[PDB]
Write a protein that binds this ligand. Structure first.
Ligand SMILES: Nc1ncnc2c1ncn2[C@@H]1O[C@H](COP(=O)(O)OP(=O)(O)O)[C@@H](O)[C@H]1O
Ligand SMILES: [Mg+2]
Ligand SMILES: [Zn+2]
Ligand SMILES: [Zn+2]
Lengths: 242, 96, 568, 239, 96
């Protein structure tokens, strides 16, 4: 509503470097940080006292890969990230974020103060709806459960067996691609072309294009999705892996 | 010194007093004050030594009181040595 | 009362009967590390049991959890346990999950014997009534306080024990109130363990010069914190020194002469192993007397050194290498120009040990070196255990420092003491510059968030030494009223603060009516009550109850709750 | 021993200019020098962050703590102990090569000389970096030093491999620096018009179409082509 | 008589500022940004703490030094990209 009123006022006055929104933060600046202070006192009162941890609890999601020590800090970081989207008001949004962090006595550029996406991604490419012949890419760590079990243009459901089959298909395809990757130099990045070589002729160590850590993260994402949605065949595949 | 140090805004007053006879050019005054007070020369374990002195270069058009600023600095600092252009050789700058 | 001073020999003989079987090792000695007096007492007992060839186990313990874990691991054959420096204030049978029925053997015949007898020895005054009175396994070596000042407590405890109408409930309430007002009292110490075991040894009659030196060291260990107790016990040690010293005085110095002497021992820091100027600059008393953290302090220090007429280079020269003129007129020089600056209390008489041509040494310097060796001799619950391992290991370094054949270790301890005094001094001056101490109506909080050598203060003795520095400094500030200070230090590896409840003390040499009354550290019950509620993952395991480990996130709420708490 | 610190002309290396232009030192003086490292400021933002964190720890008293702790850990050792250890090793061992190490060194030297010859032929200009018999002596000396620091009386092929790696990392790195163009442009245009933007083809197809073909490496630098199947398949990356 | 210390500071902002400085220097820039230049920020902050007789470098002493460094870098660039560089750097001089 703040940006809506700011845009309306700018258009009325008139009728990116600078757009209609340049001071929309001021509509809620005092209320925002006042409410943040009140919520901070409320949390500090009830962060440790039991029967409120049912409120100060971090929900478990398929994409959960970030540990939250302060749900209020996660909340304010999320609001700061959503209100940093405007390129024209970058300075005022950064100032508001700095003032909000001053309530936590945290530095403006602190790494913990930096916000990152709490959700990973796991898309199924070229998903086809067996009724309307709709081509889509079904995410699971970001897409809602209602948007994954059924199509979009129609509302017909999807086969659980097909979902598990295609998820395991992508998993095994990634495994094979990691196992069949090419090596390349670590210094001049020249692709390895022979079979017998300790390193690149420029004394560059050989390295794969697909990191093992990437496959580890993919396997963790698949396991989290299987556990969250009860994917039996996916869990069987995970057990087969190790 | 201790009393006026606790004053807030002392940095700006000091900066303005670098060149009282020279109008404007506040950034140059700030840089001159920083070089005058200087930093602390770090020396890690006696192995790694870090320069604690600030070196400042002023590039500017003639008649901009850069020479006057340098004259003020020479009159001001504790140990000041002034050399100009070709009137100072390589060995005379350091040792001979 | 369980074991009075006069009947300590009975306990000694009972222990000897119980575990003088060289086939096994049925006697185990538990000693609280990071405690000089306990170390000295354990050394006495180790030498004594080396005399009678009684096999013993010495286990240095840092935390209560370690004690309970070791007791769980403890084998049943061991029929005799010794606790040194702890266990006299907590419910050991409840702590160690002990009932008399499991350990009792040959119950019959008005007598009782037990398969495992534990003997505690600590001088903390909150004597646990269930441990001093209501048990036979727990055996306490009283120093005359329980038998004289806990008579009413004894009566109330026995009335509750025997009683498990309206007037009966009224009397039960009165007795419980008496017991409670006996409790809820700050942990204080009236005697030194070294003196108690030395008295026991004299009763056995196996004393020598070495044991007397150990008793002097143990008593000197309590001078900095409990100077009133030190003054109380000083004449006994003095008389023992007079008695034991041979009549062949003024004898020619041989490489074998071991001489204990009573001579002016000024209240300086490492005088005989550092320059006079540095001794003054690092003496806690002088620093508190002139507040050397300000720039004026060093100028006034030069002012004294000029006023006495001693050259500053001479003052800054090492003690051994000073001119004999100053080294023989130090006493008169102090007499002339000490009362002028109020440092007259520096002059003191102490005990000095000389071993042949190795040079003299004072008790204060020795205990400082021992404490330094204790402190710096060498995901979240793992590195902390490694820190406990290192802290326990330093106990053995300090122990072996007692050997006269390991003077090289003593030199390292002296250097460590100098460095630790330097670090604590610099930290105190930085804190008093930045005014990290925030004065309140309850306690003067002070938390170190970042800075130099912050990893040194996670050791409890280092934090206590810093507390001694700051409490001595604030004691000489008459404007600053009596109030405890709280110190915390974030451990970045564990992301936890080390909150150390401290206690104010009267200025040294300031003897008044209220000075005779000791200050009681009420951080124990406050800490425990705040921790029992509002679970904050607090780790309270130190035998010194006023030391806790708190989560970094929970530090601020814990301090806020403590401010809301009026228990202390 | 000689450890010299110099600066390429123009302040920066200025790799756009010829390597001989950036270095005013003649071939004669460059011949005596055994190892010639050329460090370059990558301006890699993550590397910049790492260096900035290290330097900040250096300045704010953290160095005096972490260096002492790491030295006590045993993975770093003080100046004096290294001095005495170096003295003892230099006065104790004078290792000599094994015949297998000699054969490996001779083969590597011939390879390096062939590489220098082909580089000079491609550039039609003598390389400012000289590789000669003295370079083989330098490799032999480095192998001896590697065996000596281990106090091994005889040098093994492990030392030979490590010395070859260091030589390739410093002297070949200096010698591999590069500043017809018509052929390169023609090849670029013909593959852009022929090879589809989203497709790939084998390298033997380019060989049959038709040199050193540095144009493909330059285009890989431009990220318009990419060699994936061990150099047997060039794919238009999307540019 | 003043030897200020940099205990109270945030290495994150300084590291990010140095990384961005090097990134904009290598890309469409001619001013050399080296590690010496990163040390210059701490040196100027030390001078700022000195001129207040402060023995510890406060947050203002660091922000002022960062602003001075980024402004000196920006003014050393051509006006064509100077506006974009200032727009990028504006997020670091907050408060002044
Ligand atoms: N900003 C200024 N304020 C006052 N006087 C100035 C200013 N800039 C230049 N001048 C005057 O110009 C005269 C010559 O300046 P000069 O030192 O030659 O400048 P530069 O060193 O840039 O050649 C001086 O006498 C000085 O008083
Ligand atoms: Mg001029
Ligand atoms: Zn559909
Ligand atoms: Zn390579």
């Amino acid at each position: 509503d703040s940006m809506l009123k700011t845009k309306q006022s700018y258009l009325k006055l008139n009728s990116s470097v600078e757009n209609s929104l340049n001071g929309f933060s001021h509509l809620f600046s005092k209320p925002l940080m006042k409410r943040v202070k009140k919520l901070f006192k409320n949390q500090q009162e009830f962060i440790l006292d039991p029967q409120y941890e049912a409120d100060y609890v971090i929900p478990v999601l398929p994409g959960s890969h970030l540990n939250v020590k302060n749900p209020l800090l996660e909340l304010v970081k999320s609001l700061c990230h959503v209100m940093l989207l405007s390129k024209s008001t970058i300075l005022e949004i950064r100032t508001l974020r700095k003032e909000l962090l001053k309530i936590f006595e945290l530095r403006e550029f602190a790494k913990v103060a930096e916000f990152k996406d709490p959700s990973l991604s796991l898309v199924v490419p070229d998903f086809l709806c067996e009724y309307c012949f709709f081509i889509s890419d079904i995410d699971f760590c970001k897409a809602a459960p209602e948007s994954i079990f059924s199509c979009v243009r129609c509302h017909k459901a999807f086969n659980q067996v097909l979902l598990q089959e295609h998820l395991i298909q992508k998993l095994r395809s990634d495994i094979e691609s990691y196992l069949i990757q090419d090596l390349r130099c670590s210094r001049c990045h020249k692709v390895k072309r022979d079979y017998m070589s300790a390193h690149c002729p420029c004394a560059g160590a050989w390295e794969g294009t697909l990191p093992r850590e990437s496959i580890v993260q993919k396997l963790n994402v698949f396991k989290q999705v299987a556990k969250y949605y009860g994917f039996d065949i996916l869990l069987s595949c995970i057990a087969d892996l190790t | 010194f201790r009393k006026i140090s606790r004053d807030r805004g002392i940095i700006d007053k000091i900066i303005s007093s670098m060149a009282p006879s020279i109008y404007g050019h506040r950034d140059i005054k700030t840089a001159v004050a920083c070089s005058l007070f200087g930093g602390v020369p770090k020396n890690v374990n006696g192995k790694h030594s870090i320069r604690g002195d600030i070196n400042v270069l002023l590039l500017g058009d003639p008649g901009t009181a850069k020479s006057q600023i340098l004259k003020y600095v020479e009159k001001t600092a504790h140990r000041a040595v002034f050399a100009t252009g070709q009137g100072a050789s390589a060995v005379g700058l350091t040792a001979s | 009362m369980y074991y009075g001073i006069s009947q300590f020999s009975e306990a000694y003989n009972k222990i000897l009967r119980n575990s003088s079987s060289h086939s096994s090792c049925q006697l185990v000695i538990f000693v609280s590390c990071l405690n000089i007096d306990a170390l000295c007492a354990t050394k006495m007992l180790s030498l004594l049991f080396k005399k009678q060839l009684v096999q013993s186990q010495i286990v240095p313990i840092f935390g209560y959890s370690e004690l309970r874990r070791h007791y769980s691991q403890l084998d049943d054959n061991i029929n005799s346990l010794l606790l040194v420096g702890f266990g006299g204030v907590i419910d050991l049978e409840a702590f160690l999950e002990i009932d008399p029925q499991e350990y009792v053997i040959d119950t019959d015949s008005g007598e009782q014997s037990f398969r495992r007898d534990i003997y505690v020895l600590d001088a903390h005054r909150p004597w646990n009534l269930d441990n001093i009175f209501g048990s036979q396994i727990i055996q306490c070596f009283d120093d005359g306080t329980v038998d004289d000042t806990l008579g009413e407590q004894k009566e109330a405890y026995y009335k509750l024990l025997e009683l498990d109408r309206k007037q009966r409930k009224k009397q039960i309430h009165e007795y419980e109130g008496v017991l409670e007002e006996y409790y809820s009292q700050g942990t204080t110490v009236v005697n030194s363990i070294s003196a108690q075991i030395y008295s026991l040894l004299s009763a056995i009659g196996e004393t020598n010069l070495s044991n007397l030196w150990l008793n002097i060291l143990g008593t000197t260990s309590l001078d900095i914190a409990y100077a009133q107790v030190y003054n109380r016990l000083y004449p006994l040690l003095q008389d023992e020194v007079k008695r034991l010293t041979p009549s062949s005085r003024n004898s020619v110095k041989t490489p074998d002469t071991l001489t204990l002497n009573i001579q002016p021992d000024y209240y300086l820091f490492l005088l005989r192993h550092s320059s006079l100027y540095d001794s003054f600059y690092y003496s806690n008393y002088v620093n508190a007397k002139l507040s050397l953290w300000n720039e004026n302090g060093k100028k006034r220090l030069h002012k004294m050194f000029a006023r006495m007429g001693i050259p500053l280079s001479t003052a800054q020269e090492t003690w051994l290498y000073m001119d004999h003129s100053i080294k023989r007129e130090l006493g008169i020089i102090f007499d002339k120009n000490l009362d002028r600056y109020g440092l007259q209390d520096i002059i003191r008489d102490g005990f000095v040990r000389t071993l042949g041509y190795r040079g003299s040494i004072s008790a204060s310097e020795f205990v400082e070196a021992l404490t330094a060796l204790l402190e710096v001799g060498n995901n979240s619950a793992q590195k902390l255990t490694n820190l406990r391992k290192r802290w326990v290991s330093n106990f053995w370094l300090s122990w072996d420092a007692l050997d006269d054949r390991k003077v090289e270790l003593l030199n390292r301890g002296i250097q460590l003491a100098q460095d630790l005094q330097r670090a604590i001094f610099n930290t105190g001056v930085a804190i008093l510059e930045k005014k990290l101490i925030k004065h309140l109506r309850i306690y003067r909080l002070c938390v170190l968030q970042d800075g130099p050598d912050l990893d040194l203060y996670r050791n409890p003795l280092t934090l206590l030494r810093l507390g001694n520095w700051l409490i001595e400094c604030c004691a000489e500030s008459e404007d600053k009223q009596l109030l405890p200070m709280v110190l915390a230090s974030i451990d970045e590896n564990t992301d936890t603060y080390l909150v150390a409840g401290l206690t104010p003390r009267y200025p040294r040499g300031l003897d008044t009516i209220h000075t005779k009354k000791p200050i009681l550290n009420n951080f124990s019950m406050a800490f425990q009550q705040i921790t029992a509620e509002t679970d904050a993952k607090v780790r309270i395991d130190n035998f010194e109850s006023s030391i806790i480990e708190i989560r970094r996130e929970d530090l601020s709420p814990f301090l806020e709750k403590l401010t809301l708490s009026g228990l202390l | 021993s000689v450890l010299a610190a110099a600066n390429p002309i123009y302040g920066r290396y200025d790799d756009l200019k010829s390597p001989g232009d950036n270095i005013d030192f003649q071939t004669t003086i460059l011949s005596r020098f055994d190892m010639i490292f050329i460090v370059k400021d990558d301006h890699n933002e993550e590397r910049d962050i790492s260096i900035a964190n290290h330097v900040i720890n250096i300045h704010t008293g953290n160095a005096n703590a972490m260096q002492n702790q790491q030295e006590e850990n045993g993975s770093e050792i003080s100046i004096e102990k290294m001095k005495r250890y170096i003295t003892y090793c230099r006065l104790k061992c004078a290792p000599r090569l094994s015949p297998q190490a000699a054969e490996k060194l001779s083969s590597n030297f011939v390879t390096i000389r062939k590489q220098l010859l082909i580089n000079e032929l491609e550039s039609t200009e003598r390389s400012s970096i000289p590789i000669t018999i003295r370079q083989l002596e330098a490799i032999i000396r480095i192998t001896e030093s590697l065996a000596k620091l281990e106090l091994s009386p005889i040098a093994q092929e492990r030392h030979v491999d490590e010395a070859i790696r260091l030589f390739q990392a410093s002297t070949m790195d200096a010698a591999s620096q590069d500043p017809s163009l018509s052929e390169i442009r023609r090849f670029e245009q013909e593959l852009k018009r022929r090879l589809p933007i989203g497709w790939s083809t084998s390298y033997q197809t380019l060989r049959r179409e038709f040199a050193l073909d540095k144009a493909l490496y330059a285009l890989e630098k431009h990220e318009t082509i990419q060699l994936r199947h061990q150099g047997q398949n060039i794919y238009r990356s999307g540019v | 008589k003043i030897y200020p210390k940099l205990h109270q500071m945030d290495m994150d902002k300084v590291s990010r500022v140095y990384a961005d400085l090097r990134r904009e220097s290598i890309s469409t820039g001619s001013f050399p940004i080296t590690v010496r230049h990163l040390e210059s920020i701490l040196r100027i902050a030390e001078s700022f703490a000195k001129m207040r007789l402060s023995e510890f470098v406060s947050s203002y002493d660091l922000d002022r030094a960062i602003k001075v460094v980024v402004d000196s870098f920006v003014d050393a660039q051509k006006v064509s990209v100077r506006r974009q560089l200032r727009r990028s750097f504006a997020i670091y001089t907050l408060g002044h």
